[PDB]
């Protein structure tokens, strides 16, 4: 079994504007095997609406998935992506930074 | 114009104690997914993943479902066979992946036909570019190679890759032409981010573009900064377009001397951008 | 057009 740890980006579909509706994405890529737990978090708590793309992979065989939900950015609310995968000692949390 | 491709990405994963393997097939034209099959659906069918595929009639969907199901059974058997053969005596979940399809040139010649497999994330066997011989990675794959030579598989897949593969790519490009033959230029801009007393970060953004291929480069009055920059992988926006950014750390007060250059199919010439305070 | 490996090998 090869093991490749996922690369993770968390970002909005559109430029963030507070109080304006948008989409929050967590893109996970470069990982193997395909088994992976991804959750989107609002203030530390799991969002239940989340959808994701059909599992696919790249030329080097490594998988990628897009997880996404509707959301409304705000000054006070913290959004994040939580990822777990066999290559991690414990789940990894990547916070959404609207400038990245 | 330009190159185009039709690619299928197929994944089977065994699942100890859970019964049948998870089998997922996904088809892309260029950078746009258009179909899927997933064994975990409660009525597993080959199905459209782009609205323009709804123009294919029932016979296409039925035929493709039957082919997906037949492949599903074949991967299941292969997973059971491999597990015996590699002496994976602790059991566990294992993965077989298949990639196949065609890259065609702007003149519609077949640039490359693919029919290629990986086991547990490593190359297993692949049809070579000649569409006649195989590259095998280890002795298990030599055994499968012998069987596949015996059966004439290379000749069968060569006929499909040079014929049906290309013919169906054309058809899909026509059916989806509004979306597949578009080119969405990147909307670009520069943002500014404080870092320390002595420096800051300039980040160049390219948003809303299709196809995914793009180049972003920072320069300092002509001097290429490609190697000093932080560059994220191109990422899907979720609406069929892509995004990318590239950042550079520069001395506080010299922001105006740095320029971001953007290259994309949609840009007749490179876009040049600066921080606009 | 998906095409099946339908009763081949290892």
Residue numbers in the entry:
A (entry chain B): 0 to 99
B (entry chain A): 0 to 276
C (entry chain C): 1 to 10
Reported in the publication:
Here, we used cellular and biophysical methods to investigate the molecular interaction between the G9C8 TCR and the native insulin B chain 10-mer peptide, 15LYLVCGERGF24 (G9GF) and 9-mer peptide, 15LYLVCGERG23 (G9G) as well as a heteroclitic form of the peptide, LYLVCGERV (G9V), presented by H-2Kd. We solved the atomic structures of each of the peptides in complex with H-2Kd, demonstrating the peptide residues that interact with the MHC binding groove and identifying the solvent-exposed residues that are most likely to contact the TCR. We show that insulin reactivity by a CD8+ T-cell clone, known to induce type 1 diabetes, is characterized by weak T-cell antigen receptor binding to a relatively unstable peptide-MHC. H-2Kd is unusual compared with the binding motif for most other mouse alleles (that have an anchor at position 5 and the C terminus) in that it anchors at positions 2 and the C terminus, reminiscent of most human peptide-MHC binding motifs.
H-2Kd·G9G crystallized in space group P1, and H-2Kd·G9V crystallized in two distinct space groups, P1 and P1 21 1 (only the P1 data set is shown here in detail), which showed identical features (data not shown). H-2Kd·G9GF crystallized in space group P 21 21 21 with three copies in the asymmetric unit (omit maps and density plots are shown in Fig. 4). For G9GF, clear electron density was only observed for peptide residues 1–4, indicating flexibility in the rest of the peptide. Indeed, although all three copies were identical at the N-terminal end of the peptide, in copies 1 and 2, the peptide appeared to be anchored mainly at position 9, with position 10 extending out toward the end of the MHC groove and performing a secondary anchoring role (G9GF-stretched). In copy 3, the peptide appeared to be anchored at position 10 (G9GF-bulged). However, in the more dominant conformation observed in the other two copies in the asymmetric unit (G9GF-stretched), the C terminus of the MHC α1 helix flexed by 1.8 Å, allowing Phe-10 to slide further down into the opening of the groove. Additionally, MHC residue Tyr-84 side chain underwent a large movement of 8.2 Å to swing out of the way of Phe-10, compared with its position in the G9GF-bulged, G9G, and G9V structures. Tyr-84 made three vdWs and one HB with the peptide in the G9G structure but in that position would cause a steric clash with Phe-10 in the G9GF structure. In its alternative position in the G9GF-stretched structure, Tyr-84 could potentially form stabilizing interactions, including CH-π (π edge-to-face) interactions with Phe-10, known to be important for peptide-MHC binding. Thus, the dynamic movement by Tyr-84 in the G9GF-stretched structure might allow Phe-10 to be accommodated by the MHC F-pocket rather than forming a more prominent central bulge, observed in most other MHCI structures with longer (>9 residues) peptides.
